[PDB]
Amino acid sequence: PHMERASLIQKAKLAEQAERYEDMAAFMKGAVEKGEELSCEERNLLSVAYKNVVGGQRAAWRVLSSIEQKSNEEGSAAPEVREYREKVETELQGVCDTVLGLLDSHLIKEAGDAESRVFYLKMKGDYYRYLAEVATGDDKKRIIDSARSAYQEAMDISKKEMPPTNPIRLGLALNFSVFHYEIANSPEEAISLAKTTFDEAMADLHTLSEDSYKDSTLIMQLLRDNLTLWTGS
């Protein structure tokens, strides 16, 4: 048998090594469902697992939707694209709904510490943002807002409890700025957030230790890359 918590975490680590992220997410969902708090290491296993799962689905959906755009333009040729893009969409939506379900049923705890609350709320914003990437209906407004709320709630915590060099704070601001640019269609808000975030973390880089510096400068480079792309430096 061996579907006790420790064994589920062991199997999620093993699934990661084997690049079986569908399986890893399943083990992590089962581990979450045991009701114990996730350690920082455990949190990352859950995040990595689902990030990879949705990652592949989103990637596929983008491929199909671009093809569909070509198919429906003025003066092109003569349903499979739409049908199959809908299959992938439904599948992707199901995964987000699963992650969001876990976050609201077990992971988001008023009781949790600042770094973990931020982690999960950033996660809630990411997965709603993923739903908003494919949302076309009247639901788009509700979804967009559900992501805004989660990121903003996470922002508020990160800005009080964390230093501007915190990789979790940095990561959140990066994603929230991507949300503004892509989803909310607020490039001005996005550029500013990314600029401020980077500039504030830069002003504190001197204090950081060997390990801290590596994780922080990683995200800062992602912010800088985005800023270069968005502004045209």
Binding site: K51, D126, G171, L174, V178, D225, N226, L229, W230
Partner: peptide, 7 residues
Amino acid sequence: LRRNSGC
């Protein structure tokens, strides 16, 4: 050339 987000 694609925007960066979560690692």
